[PDB]
């Protein structure tokens, strides 16, 4: 896809973490760890080095990881993640 991205469907449950840690890298949001025993490991859908470009149609480039956390805390259901694999 655009910038070589892929579309991934990620389930988000209120008060349950997705099970991945994220960091800012310049103007990007990058997945840094897939937490062992968490939901993201179980689904196999997110990976270290993945760049998050969009979450449910919201552009993520340039956003602080704190805003990403806040955004996700306000969402539940099946979310559309647009990712660039590493």
């Amino acid at each position: 896809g655009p910038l070589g991205s892929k579309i991934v469907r990620i389930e988000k449950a209120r008060d349950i973490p997705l099970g991945a840690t994220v960091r800012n890298e310049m103007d990007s949001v990058i997945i840094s760890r897939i937490v062992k025993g968490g939901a993201a490991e179980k689904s196999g859908l997110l990976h270290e080095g993945d760049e998050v470009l969009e979450i449910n149609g919201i552009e993520i480039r340039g956003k602080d990881v704190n805003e990403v956390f806040d955004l996700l805390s306000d969402m539940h259901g099946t979310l559309t993640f647009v990712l660039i694999p590493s």
Binding site: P17, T21, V22, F69
Partner: peptide, 4 residues
């Protein structure tokens, strides 16, 4: 880093 930040857990989501």
């Amino acid at each position: 880093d930040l857990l989501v």
